[PDB]
Amino acid sequence: SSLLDLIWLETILPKTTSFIQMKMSIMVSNQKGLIKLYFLSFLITIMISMTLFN
Amino acid sequence: MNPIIYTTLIMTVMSGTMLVMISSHWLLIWIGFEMNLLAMIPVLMKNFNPRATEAATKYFLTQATASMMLMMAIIINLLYSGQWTITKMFNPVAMTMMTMALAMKLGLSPFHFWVPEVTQGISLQAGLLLLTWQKLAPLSVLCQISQSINPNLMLTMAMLSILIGGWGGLNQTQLRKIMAYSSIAHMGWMTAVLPYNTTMTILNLLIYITMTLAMFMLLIHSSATTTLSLSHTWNKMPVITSLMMVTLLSMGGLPPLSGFMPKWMIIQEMTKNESIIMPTLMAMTALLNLYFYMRLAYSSSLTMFPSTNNMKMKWQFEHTKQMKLLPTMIVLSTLVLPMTPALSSLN
Amino acid sequence: MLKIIIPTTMLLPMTWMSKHNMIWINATVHSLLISLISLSLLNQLGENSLNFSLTFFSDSLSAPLLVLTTWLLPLMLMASQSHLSKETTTRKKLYITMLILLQLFLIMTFTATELILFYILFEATLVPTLIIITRWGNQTERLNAGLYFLFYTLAGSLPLLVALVYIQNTTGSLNFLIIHYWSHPLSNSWSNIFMWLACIMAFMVKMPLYGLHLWLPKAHVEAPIAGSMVLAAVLLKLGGYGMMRITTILNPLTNYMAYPFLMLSMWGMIMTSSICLRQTDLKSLIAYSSVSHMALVIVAIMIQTPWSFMGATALMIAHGLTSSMLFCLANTNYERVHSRTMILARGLQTLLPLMATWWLVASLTNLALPPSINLIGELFIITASFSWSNITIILMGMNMMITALYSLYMLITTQRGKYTHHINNIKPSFTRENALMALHILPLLLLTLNPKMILGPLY
Amino acid sequence: PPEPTIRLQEDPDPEDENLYEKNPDSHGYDKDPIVDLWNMRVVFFFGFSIVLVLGSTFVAYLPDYRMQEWARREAERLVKYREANGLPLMESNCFDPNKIQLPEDED
Amino acid sequence: MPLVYMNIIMAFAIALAGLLMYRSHLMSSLLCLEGMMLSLFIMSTLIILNTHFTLANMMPIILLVFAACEAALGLSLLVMVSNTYGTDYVQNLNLLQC
Amino acid sequence: TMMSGRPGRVPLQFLPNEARSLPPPKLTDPRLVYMGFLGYCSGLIDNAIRRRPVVSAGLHRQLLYVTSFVFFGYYLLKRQDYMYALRDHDMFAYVKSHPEDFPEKDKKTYGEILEEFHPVR
Amino acid sequence: ARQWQPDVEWAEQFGGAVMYPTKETAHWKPPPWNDVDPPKNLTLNFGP
Amino acid sequence: LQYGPLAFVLGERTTRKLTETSKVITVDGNICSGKGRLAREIAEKLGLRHFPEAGIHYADSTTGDGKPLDVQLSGNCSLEKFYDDPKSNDGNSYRLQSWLYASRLLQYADALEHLLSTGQGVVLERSIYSDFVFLEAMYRQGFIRKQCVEHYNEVKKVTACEYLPPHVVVYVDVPVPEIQSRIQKKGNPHEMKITAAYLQDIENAYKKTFLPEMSEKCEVLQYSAREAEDAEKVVEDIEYLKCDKGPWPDQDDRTFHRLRMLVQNKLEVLNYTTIPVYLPEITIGAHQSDRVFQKFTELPGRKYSPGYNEDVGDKWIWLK
Numbered sequence A: 001s002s003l004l005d006l007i008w009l010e011t012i013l014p015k016t017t018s019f020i021q022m023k024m025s026i027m028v029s030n031q032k033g034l035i036k037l038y039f040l041s042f043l044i045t046i047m048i049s050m051t052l053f054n
Numbered sequence B: 001m002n003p004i005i006y007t008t009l010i011m012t013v014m015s016g017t018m019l020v021m022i023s024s025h026w027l028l029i030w031i032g033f034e035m036n037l038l039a040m041i042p043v044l045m046k047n048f049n050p051r052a053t054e055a056a057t058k059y060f061l062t063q064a065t066a067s068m069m070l071m072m073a074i075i076i077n078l079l080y081s082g083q084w085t086i087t088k089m090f091n092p093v094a095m096t097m098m099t100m101a102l103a104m105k106l107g108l109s110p111f112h113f114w115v116p117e118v119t120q121g122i123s124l125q126a127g128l129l130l131l132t133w134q135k136l137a138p139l140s141v142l143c144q145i146s147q148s149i150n151p152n153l154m155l156t157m158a159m160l161s162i163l164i165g166g167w168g169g170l171n172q173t174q175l176r177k178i179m180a181y182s183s184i185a186h187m188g189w190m191t192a193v194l195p196y197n198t199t200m201t202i203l204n205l206l207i208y209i210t211m212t213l214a215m216f217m218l219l220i221h222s223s224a225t226t227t228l229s230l231s232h233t234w235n236k237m238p239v240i241t242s243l244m245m246v247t248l249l250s251m252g253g254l255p256p257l258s259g260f261m262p263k264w265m266i267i268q269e270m271t272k273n274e275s276i277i278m279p280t281l282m283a284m285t286a287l288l289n290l291y292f293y294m295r296l297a298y299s300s301s302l303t304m305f306p307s308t309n310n311m312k313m314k315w316q317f318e319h320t321k322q323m324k325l326l327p328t329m330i331v332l333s334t335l336v337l338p339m340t341p342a343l344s345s346l347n
Numbered sequence C: 001m002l003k004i005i006i007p008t009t010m011l012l013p014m015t016w017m018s019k020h021n022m023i024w025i026n027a028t029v030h031s032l033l034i035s036l037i038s039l040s041l042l043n044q045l046g047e048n049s050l051n052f053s054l055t056f057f058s059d060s061l062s063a064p065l066l067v068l069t070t071w072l073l074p075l076m077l078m079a080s081q082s083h084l085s086k087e088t089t090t091r092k093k094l095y096i097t098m099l100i101l102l103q104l105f106l107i108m109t110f111t112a113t114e115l116i117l118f119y120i121l122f123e124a125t126l127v128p129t130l131i132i133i134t135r136w137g138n139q140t141e142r143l144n145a146g147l148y149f150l151f152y153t154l155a156g157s158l159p160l161l162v163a164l165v166y167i168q169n170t171t172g173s174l175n176f177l178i179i180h181y182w183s184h185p186l187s188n189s190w191s192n193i194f195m196w197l198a199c200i201m202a203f204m205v206k207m208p209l210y211g212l213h214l215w216l217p218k219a220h221v222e223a224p225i226a227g228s229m230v231l232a233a234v235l236l237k238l239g240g241y242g243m244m245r246i247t248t249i250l251n252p253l254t255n256y257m258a259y260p261f262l263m264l265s266m267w268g269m270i271m272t273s274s275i276c277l278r279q280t281d282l283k284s285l286i287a288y289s290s291v292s293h294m295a296l297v298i299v300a301i302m303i304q305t306p307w308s309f310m311g312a313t314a315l316m317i318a319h320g321l322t323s324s325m326l327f328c329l330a331n332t333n334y335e336r337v338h339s340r341t342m343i344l345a346r347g348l349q350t351l352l353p354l355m356a357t358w359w360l361v362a363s364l365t366n367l368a369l370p371p372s373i374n375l376i377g378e379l380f381i382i383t384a385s386f387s388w389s390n391i392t393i394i395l396m397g398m399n400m401m402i403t404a405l406y407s408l409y410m411l412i413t414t415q416r417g418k419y420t421h422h423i424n425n426i427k428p429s430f431t432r433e434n435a436l437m438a439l440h441i442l443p444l445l446l447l448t449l450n451p452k453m454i455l456g457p458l459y
Numbered sequence D: 001p002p003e004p005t006i007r008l009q010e011d012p013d014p015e016d017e018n019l020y021e022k023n024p025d026s027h028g029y030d031k032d033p034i035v036d037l038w039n040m041r042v043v044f045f046f047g048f049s050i051v052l053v054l055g056s057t058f059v060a061y062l063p064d065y066r067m068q069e070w071a072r073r074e075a076e077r078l079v080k081y082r083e084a085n086g087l088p089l090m091e092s093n094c095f096d097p098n099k100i101q102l103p104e105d106e107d
Numbered sequence E: 001m002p003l004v005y006m007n008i009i010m011a012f013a014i015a016l017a018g019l020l021m022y023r024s025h026l027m028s029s030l031l032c033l034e035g036m037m038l039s040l041f042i043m044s045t046l047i048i049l050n051t052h053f054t055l056a057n058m059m060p061i062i063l064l065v066f067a068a069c070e071a072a073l074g075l076s077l078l079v080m081v082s083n084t085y086g087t088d089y090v091q092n093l094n095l096l097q098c
Numbered sequence F: 001t002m003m004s005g006r007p008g009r010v011p012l013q014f015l016p017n018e019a020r021s022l023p024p025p026k027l028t029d030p031r032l033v034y035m036g037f038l039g040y041c042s043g044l045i046d047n048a049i050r051r052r053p054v055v056s057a058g059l060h061r062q063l064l065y066v067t068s069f070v071f072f073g074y075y076l077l078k079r080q081d082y083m084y085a086l087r088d089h090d091m092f093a094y095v096k097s098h099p100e101d102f103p104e105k106d107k108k109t110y111g112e113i114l115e116e117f118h119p120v121r
Numbered sequence G: 001a002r003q004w005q006p007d008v009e010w011a012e013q014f015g016g017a018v019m020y021p022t023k024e025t026a027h028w029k030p031p032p033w034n035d036v037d038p039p040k041n042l043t044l045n046f047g048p
Numbered sequence H: 001l002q003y004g005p006l007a008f009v010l011g012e013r014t015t016r017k018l019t020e021t022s023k024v025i026t027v028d029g030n031i032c033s034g035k036g037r038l039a040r041e042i043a044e045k046l047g048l049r050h051f052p053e054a055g056i057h058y059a060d061s062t063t064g065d066g067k068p069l070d071v072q073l074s075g076n077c078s079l080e081k082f083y084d085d086p087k088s089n090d091g092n093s094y095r096l097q098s099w100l101y102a103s104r105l106l107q108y109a110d111a112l113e114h115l116l117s118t119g120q121g122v123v124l125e126r127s128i129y130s131d132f133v134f135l136e137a138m139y140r141q142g143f144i145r146k147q148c149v150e151h152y153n154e155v156k157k158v159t160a161c162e163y164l165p166p167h168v169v170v171y172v173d174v175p176v177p178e179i180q181s182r183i184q185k186k187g188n189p190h191e192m193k194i195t196a197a198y199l200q201d202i203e204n205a206y207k208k209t210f211l212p213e214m215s216e217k218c219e220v221l222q223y224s225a226r227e228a229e230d231a232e233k234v235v236e237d238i239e240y241l242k243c244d245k246g247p248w249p250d251q252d253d254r255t256f257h258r259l260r261m262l263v264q265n266k267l268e269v270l271n272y273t274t275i276p277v278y279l280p281e282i283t284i285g286a287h288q289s290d291r292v293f294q295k296f297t298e299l300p301g302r303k304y305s306p307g308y309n310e311d312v313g314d315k316w317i318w319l320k
């Protein structure tokens, strides 16, 4: 009743997925709105696209 | 602004898009992009405030950089072959540069950072225009040059767009940011099928445009830009909230609604090309978009949030201005699945 | 087959155009007439099927499920008449519309000659039930229950769509007749293993399989009475139906790919039956009992023998009827006590004797008392498992023991003992509730006279 | 602390309304006696009288489309024919081997 | 492809990197954009003149004009931003965020 | 497929002249009825949005909705049928012109095909 | 005896600038109801 | 053809209707001062349209039938109970203040719409400006909390940032003992319970804040009790002055078109009066809101649009 059904079966599939998605959402959406970082990342991805793929 | 000047600017935006769509010379396509941006900048600042100016300047910076890289790719393609016609490119470096420029224009990740900010800064009507009409020209150019695109880069940015939209939409209470992230995810879905079939790209574009038009017109009707301001709508006009919930369910790809039609077909097409892992990842990722659509539906129509006392006075007034084609948009965004085989019309 | 589809579609206009005080009567009468019409599907033939057209076809597996689906709706309307009394006419019509749409999708799902149409309707059913759970639910946990129910299903089901489109691209068709006739063995390969997993997960998630069942107590406890009835009786069987359709293309892989699920179900029926012994909620107890019975059904389907399939069909029908009746009785108690706690309202045999005998009969069918069809399904599945491996009898016998134990525990705690002193609003049982119980229980004891009607296509 | 301890403006929770107190012999279908009585009548007639009894009788007398007695008669005549002529009842080969072309091994 | 084309392409890349660096002074962003345009004009003119593609001689002028229009647009926007903050600092543009 | 570059394709024709050699869809087509139903649904949605009696507010408006939907659906069905007919025509022509890539399989009978048997135990 | 509906406390979850507040974004403040932010002639001495 | 972008495109301009007589005037004064009679006389003499002061049921007189509706459906507040029990636990004081501010905003929108559409000027009582004096009076008296005044300030800022302030503001100055005697002679039992501190605080808010802040952007005519009866002189000073410091001269056809879009379509005027900030005095539970809205829908001419209500006698429904 408690150890597997209420705790571990919840911890494995739903709770872990929710935690991971929440953490990734926080990481993605936490941008200060400063374009310095945006265009620095733009330069990085432009160089990466030029070099790695071809 | 003056209504005549507003009509002139809107017509100039549409004329730039049409000039991109109807021309076969790369210089004319670049000119059409330039005209589209030049006429679009004022529309974003139709209501003057610091936020609108910030959105307009960010949009101008990104679009000007994208146009300059577009011209760079065009001139390199001319260098390695004296051709001005828009066809398969003759140089790989120019091809990657053109792909990145068009991805920046569309908002595909990692060039997605400007979309939520520009959408939040501008009003709802400008956001509707930006998220619907501004996706036509770059997608038309991509459909024209699809045969030369490298699948690896194009699909990498498609999958990145889907993942980024799904993750970024989960953290938003503002409705315009939610719309921007949803648009990023749908552009990611659109892009992932360009190497294999452009008819599927056009089908997804049309369905998404219908769904976004319905969403934005419903948001304009109930003048709400946040979750909590929208939560008050049930106490004035519940029919709007019910239609909005059905539209949100359709946008999440739930069968038997219209939003299931693109993904389904897209998956089908990808399966024809021995691609199995990517469609699976894309579907499980679109589950995130469905999640935050469901959260919006929960806070909007499936529960009744507390109201305010002044609401009573708003009960005595009707909407003076009506948006025509709203019922048509809702019906076309919810109940067109049984007519899926019409895509042979090459929409 | 359109002779059943069109009248169901016809119910929606009738409900909307009906008088503010005549919706329930019209809906119940015409749904009962449609249920009567559906009985013509029971005249099956020992040969292939009743292939009505290119789109729909009926079998001896689809016919009992269709009859049960059509029969449920009047009972759901009868049960929903009570707690929607203070509800506006537009919203009552919306609730009836949700029920009608759910029944239409369920009807079109079982015929569904092609697999993609089956998937489309099989996932279309997900929307009306989600709306019913998240709108007309009392507690604040209905939102979480709806989210769990939606996402478990969709996560399990999307790889099924990918697998189906792949199979159609490789074989050229997804029509069930062509699939059955042109069937070929599945080679022992990693790609074939993952195709098997994709084809299997979607239906294992909604039985539900043990470990993948966490959404079910949530969705069933927090849903309204009609939602609970339709969830327990019909929506759980869909996956079962789906398996008996798809496992025709998964041989001989199923010979060893079924070991994890066989072990999971065999241990999970014991685990859930033991969970039922320590439960402070009636609806949770009924939900976990449903989980145990569907675990037995999973074992039956995975064994892949004719007796297994006959037992599985009989068990699905019997469990649907029994669980619907149990939920209705629990809701009759709840509408008086407003607590949904098993230990609070006690000694109700003294105050509601006919409700007490209804509880007794429902529990007895839950005990799988012969010669009821619950016992028929149980015994067929047990015999098939014994043929599969003689050691399974330990687990099946232990499950039978615990099932009898918790069923009689549920009966004794609520009906026997001394009444609670401070509860003085135990009104006499209404004629509507007694009619609902009778219309639940009489079909079971009438089906025990003609078992071949619900023993499936392998009879 | 000048707070009124009231978080908002809300109606009180209304009490359960007994359908028996205003109308005895109430049948529990509706709060209007005429509509309630007709609901009881239609439910009982269409469920117990029409569907439950006539449907059960219709199911009981369904023609043998499964061909149980047909198979019984076919088996009876096959058994009679094979016992009269001394055939070995059922044969162990479902299909006669004269039309099965096994692959020659040459191992 | 001789060394002159390489040098002009490298100048374009340097201007693009400088535009993407964004230390401060949005005026510098506009300046880097216009240096990118100048490099584009220069090497496009070289390509067209080398190949003697007569009808293409109009293309640079056109490009120039259009790009200059954008500069005006950008300049106007810059002024607006200053009118709200007093300076054209890039870090003042942080009201809207992801 | 990608028949955009198909030879002899008029750049902006909704329905070519050869499409007239195909049977037009019947006015009682189920898809045409579905478009009419979609138009009726749009009319009802319009009545609901403007706070009017949904079923019986504007009969002329609902009639126009249904009529326009049926009109556009008829032409759309014609175009779709023509496009599918073109696909089938090109398929059959390509199969006919390349017999080396679509050879005829020698008919083999199940009495002489060895299939592995997998017992269920 | 009554179906639960959201109260003020339940609604305060959706009133923040972002979902799932963090230590860094605790500082972030919600935008104005109307989307306008507060804005927050030279002298010359011509001498001899 | 309702006025919109097309009407402005073809012919509709609002600068050809202004004839220097628009000059929207508002008259401000303490409770029981003769500002209403003076405003009515000014409107009569100058040919302007008089707007009686906004009450609880002002909006009820502009929609459907002019008859007021129930207090439960319109306002959910009463002035008499505020006078009887200003410190009650149900928050009637701030609910009344917020409803009165919303009604005043709607009245100002109607007056501006009339002035722009016809060109004839209008005269008003206490406008959205000077509505804050009552808010301050309740706050210093302890009737309402600080959260209420902060919410009022937010709503007032967001709403009043979009309308042109009046040209002429007229203040009638009556000392607190005089208006106290006037109240005592009025005969209204609930008005007798107004404390002298409340009237003193209203006058203090008028003099200390409202008058100086209006004087910096427009022209003020501060009049005492004796100089208020001779309306001829009041009209004389009204006509003599010329407004060159307000924003009205700076307005032109484009701004006038935007303002005329704003003033009509009252749902945008009242849009920000219902911002989702949950003050216990004004926020309402879901069940009460649901049942009250359902009751409001049941009203005779309120279920559908005004032209689609059969029970109030609308015909030709199926062809409109």
Ligand SMILES: CCCCCCCCCCCCCCCCCC(=O)OC[C@H](COP(=O)([O-])OCC(O)COP(=O)([O-])OC[C@@H](COC(=O)CCCCCCCCCCCCCCCCC)OC(=O)CCCCCCCCCCCCCCCCC)OC(=O)CCCCCCCCCCCCCCCCC
Pocket (backbone or CB within 6 Å): B238, B239, B242, B243, B245, B246, B256, B301, B302, B334, B335, C009, C013, C014, C016, C017, C090, C091, C094, C097, C101, C104, C127, C128, C131, C135, F041, F044, F045, F048, F052, F053, F054, F055
């Ligand atoms: C397999 C496919 C087959 C099935 C198809 C299904 C879809 C078909 C219809 C699609 C939509 C078209 C019509 C909808 C119009 C909306 C108007 C409305 O709200 O209803 C009010 C109106 C009655 O109310 P009223 O007195 O006029 O005024 C009240 C106000 O309108 C409003 O009253 P109010 O404001 O006072 O009440 C408030 C209420 C009002 O708000 C609403 O109810 C809005 C309606 C919901 C939005 C519709 C969705 C758009 C289409 C998507 C459909 C999704 C289906 C896919 C499956 C997923 C399920 C979601 O809002 C709420 O209560 C919110 C809380 C509820 C939570 C959300 C509920 C879930 C919504 C999803 C509904 C999906 C099915 C819709 C079925 C039809 C509903 C009317 O209903 C109608 O009368 C129209 C019904 C249809 C008319 C039939 C007439 C024909 C009969 C005679 C001819 C016979 C024909 C056969 C020929 C043979 C003869 C011989």
Ligand SMILES: CCCCCCCCCCCCCCCCC[C@@H](O)O[C@H](CO[C@H](O)CCCCCCCCCCCCCCC)COP(=O)(O)OCC[N+](C)(C)C
Pocket (backbone or CB within 6 Å): B202, B203, B206, B207, B210, B332, B333, B336, B339, B340, B341, B342, B343, B345, B346, B347, F004, F010, F011, F012, F013, F014, F072
């Ligand atoms: C919700 C679905 C999307 C909205 C549906 C459309 C609604 C508005 C349409 C109203 C009329 C528009 C039709 C256009 C009139 C003339 C068309 C003609 O001039 O152009 C043809 C073009 O016509 C279009 O191909 C067909 C348009 C029909 C779109 C509907 C199909 C959408 C998919 C099915 C979803 C359900 C639809 C049914 C419900 C309404 C020729 O195309 P062509 O210049 O040579 O090649 C360009 C395309 N390429 C490059 C890809 C090859």
Ligand SMILES: CCCCCCCCCCCCCCCCC[C@@H](O)O[C@H](CO[C@H](O)CCCCCCCCCCCCCCC)COP(=O)(O)OCC[N+](C)(C)C
Pocket (backbone or CB within 6 Å): C188, C189, C190, C193, C210, C211, C212, C257, C260, C261, C264
């Ligand atoms: C949590 C509640 C239940 C959720 C669902 C549970 C059901 C999922 C379980 C999946 C069933 C089995 C998956 C793969 C089984 C293959 C057979 C394997 O077990 O046996 C050996 C396989 O060898 C090793 O196992 C290699 C695989 C090792 C790595 C796989 C991970 C195994 C455990 C993962 C469980 C995680 C479950 C949840 C995932 C999200 C035999 O070795 P070999 O004869 O040479 O190879 C035979 C297979 N060939 C012929 C195709 C090549």
Ligand SMILES: CCCCCCCCCCCCCCCCC[C@@H](O)O[C@H](CO[C@H](O)CCCCCCCCCCCCCCC)COP(=O)(O)OCC[N+](C)(C)C
Pocket (backbone or CB within 6 Å): C039, C064, C067, C068, C071, C317, C443, C446, C447, C449, C450, C454, D051, D052, D055, D056, D057, D059, D060, D061, D062
């Ligand atoms: C209150 C105290 C008691 C008072 C009453 C006293 C009388 C008691 C007598 C009744 C019980 C004693 C047993 C007597 C049984 C006789 C009838 C039975 O033998 O007939 C069965 C027949 O019963 C039916 O087959 C079963 C009834 C149908 C059940 C369907 C339920 C109706 C629809 C309801 C909705 C469905 C929901 C569930 C979905 C599956 C089997 O007959 P069978 O020998 O074989 O063939 C019929 C004759 N032939 C040979 C000519 C063909």
Ligand SMILES: CCCCCCCC/C=C\CCCCCCCC(=O)O[C@H](COC(=O)CCCCCCC/C=C/CCCCCCCC)COP(=O)(O)OCCN
Pocket (backbone or CB within 6 Å): B274, B276, B277, B280, C152, C155, C156, C157, C159, C162, C163, C166, C191, C192, C194, C195, C196, C197, C198, C201, C205, C212
């Ligand atoms: C309730 C939550 C459950 C969530 C669902 C999980 C189901 C897991 C099943 C796998 C999903 C995708 C399977 C692909 C669909 C079948 C298509 C197929 O078989 O084609 C295979 C494709 O096979 C794959 O790509 C499988 C890769 C798996 C990717 C996703 C991994 C997900 C996690 C895997 C481990 C766990 C699996 C079981 C988990 C059970 C649920 C807990 C190869 O085809 P070809 O390449 O064209 O031919 C071979 C010669 N070229």
Ligand SMILES: Nc1ncnc2c1ncn2[C@@H]1O[C@H](COP(=O)(O)OP(=O)(O)O)[C@@H](O)[C@H]1O
Pocket (backbone or CB within 6 Å): H030, H031, H032, H033, H035, H036, H053, H079, H096, H097, H100, H131, H134, H135, H191
């Ligand atoms: N903003 C407000 N808050 C509370 N009460 C107000 C407000 N505005 C007006 N009132 C009340 O309206 C009543 C009548 O207004 P008033 O003009 O002062 O008297 P009269 O109509 O007799 O000239 C007064 O009792 C006054 O207190």
